[PDB]
């Protein structure tokens, strides 16, 4: 009731992101990972948080099968992304990596989505460049926590603790509305990099 175990990591069920009074509920949890030549790799453990009023905004999907919600062209993914409530994603690093590869991999994933939506101009390009430059001096060892907090739909407050504590300060803020939406799409869109977290969110909504 106080915590859920996600790939071995304790994720709080209720959580106020750094510098925020608004309390968010754990709506779904999961991982990023893959299989390579038979071995399962886990990159991160993830939890998606939102204000408890989110269920009231997605009433139409209640009672439907999760298959219907997560299927392509259902419309659920964008509806979830657009719901006008505060949201947060927590990422706990499992496979330790350097900040530069992590930020640079974000850059290319968000760029692909922005180009596909005809939304990638010099402003978005510069915003991703500065996002990479935020991450590149950091190390992301096993246990490090990253908090992305959409207090508005058009900004992302980023909090980071390399040592695995829960950060209490905001280290960086994405101020580009298109980048902020593309980052939500990276985790909740049809081409999500964590289909496990999206399916978990979908199950809680349809329950």
């Amino acid at each position: 009731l106080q915590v859920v175990n996600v790939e071995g990591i304790d994720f709080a069920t209720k959580f106020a992101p750094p510098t925020s009074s608004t309390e968010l509920d754990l709506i779904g949890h999961g991982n990023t990972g893959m299989e390579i030549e038979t071995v399962e790799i886990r990159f991160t453990a993830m939890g998606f948080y939102a204000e408890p009023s989110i269920s009231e905004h997605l009433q139409k999907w209640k009672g439907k099968a999760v298959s219907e919600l997560v299927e392509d062209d259902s419309g659920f993914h964008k509806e979830l992304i657009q719901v006008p409530v505060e949201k947060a994603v927590r990422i706990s690093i499992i496979k330790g990596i350097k900040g530069l590869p992590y930020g640079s991999a974000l850059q290319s994933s968000l760029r692909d989505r922005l180009v596909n939506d005809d939304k990638f101009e010099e402003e978005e390009e510069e915003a991703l460049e500065k996002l990479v430059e935020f991450f590149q001096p950091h190390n992301l060892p096993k246990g490090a926590n990253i908090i992305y907090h959409w207090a508005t739909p058009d900004t992302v407050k980023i909090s980071l603790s390399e040592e695995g504590k829960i950060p209490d300060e905001v280290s960086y803020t994405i101020e580009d509305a298109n980048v902020a939406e593309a980052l939500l799409d990276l985790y909740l869109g049809e081409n999500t990099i964590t289909p496990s977290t999206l399916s978990s969110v979908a199950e809680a909504i349809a329950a």
Binding site: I36, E37, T38, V39, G96, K98
Partner: protein, 389 residues
Amino acid sequence: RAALPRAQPRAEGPACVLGIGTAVPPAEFLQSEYPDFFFNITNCGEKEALKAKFKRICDKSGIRKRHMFLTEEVLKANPGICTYMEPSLNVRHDIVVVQVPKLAAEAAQKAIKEWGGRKSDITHIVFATTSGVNMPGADHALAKLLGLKPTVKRVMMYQTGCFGGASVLRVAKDLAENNKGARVLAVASEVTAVTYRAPSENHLDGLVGSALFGDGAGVYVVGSDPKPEVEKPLFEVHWAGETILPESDGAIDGHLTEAGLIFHLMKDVPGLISKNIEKFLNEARKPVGSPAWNEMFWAVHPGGPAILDQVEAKLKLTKDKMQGSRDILSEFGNMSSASVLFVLDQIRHRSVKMGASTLGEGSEFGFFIGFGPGLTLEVLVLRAAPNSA
């Protein structure tokens, strides 16, 4: 001011593979016995679940044996290499700065013998490796081991990764075609002492490299305009190109650290290659008349079984096409930049053994494919010579 004639004259014909040589360290490691040896010599025998995951990779790897300079004796003499992350780059470099050019020199002697020319006529060295770096470079060290002329022109490509064997053939193509009489040593040599690492549950993708990577060197003599009845071309190079694959950015990281070279695998590499390879190959084959896939031979880098399986299935190849690659995977594992040079040689050997009409198992044209970080896909289009002594 008037134009001048080309001051260093160019050659006319396509760059040809005139001779091939390969070399491996003598110690053989049977894959059926490697999990026990590896986990014991790294002092990880208590990690039973981790070892089971490694056994599973090895059993699926399609590798019967690998050759390695890192014997028991060498590992015992270099305990830092048998750890997970202790400082060890200095003793690793002490190994590879000698062994990488030495192995290449052994392969080059054979290539030079098949070619039939004399070493004083070698004009260029193009050298790829992923196994450490040094100053002077391994190209310079190779030049001395072979006793080449002091004026040999050199292209040292350190830290290539698995596409490096295609890279040296691509560079050799332009060096040989643009220089009349040029004879190029295209060299790829790999020794795993910079990547070898104890297994760790915190580095599960590293288990894959530990199961696949072996040692070896290949060398081609490359030149345009072969002397009739004196030099014999095995393959002509007609096209060389490369591309980064869509949505593949960040798939492979390789950090050279105080603890040696560490690979991070962040995306599905077999999936990215198979999904995107056909669109690129379709452009590459146009200059040779766009033969059907099953009318061509396939010297594909054997990065691992999944890549060969998924590419074969995407392109609907008959099962003989990938056999040369699987033969090299079986007998040598993944020798990084050197492997694809071994594969083409094995296709030529298979052709001779089966009495095919060409050295490409009867196909006239074929691909020579490498891939690696980027993700970078490197492709050359080759013409196989007729099979005739």
